[PDB]
Amino acid sequence: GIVEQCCTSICSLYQLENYCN
Amino acid sequence: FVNQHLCGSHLVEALYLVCGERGFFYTPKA
């Protein structure tokens, strides 16, 4: 989920935008 | 500013800045 992809490993804009409504 | 380890309130704040008026969903445990 988001923690694993952005906290535990380096985030990206592509990934953050997947959580926008 | 988003290509880094973003954890806790730091991650929430990045979602807030990037998503804007669209809003977002934050599900840590999933």
Side-chain angles (χ1 to χ4, degrees), chain A residues 16, chain B residues 1 6-19 24:
Chain A
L16 285 173
Chain B
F1 70 91
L6 299 176
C7 298
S9 69
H10 305 200
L11 179 56
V12 159
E13 174 173 298
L15 278 171
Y16 173 73
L17 288 179
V18 168
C19 306
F24 59 88

Side-chain angles (χ1 to χ4, degrees), chain A residues 7-21:
Chain A
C7 170
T8 285
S9 68
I10 301 179
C11 204
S12 80
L13 180 64
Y14 191 116
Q15 234 110 248
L16 285 173
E17 280 193 336
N18 291 326
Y19 302 90
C20 301
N21 296 126

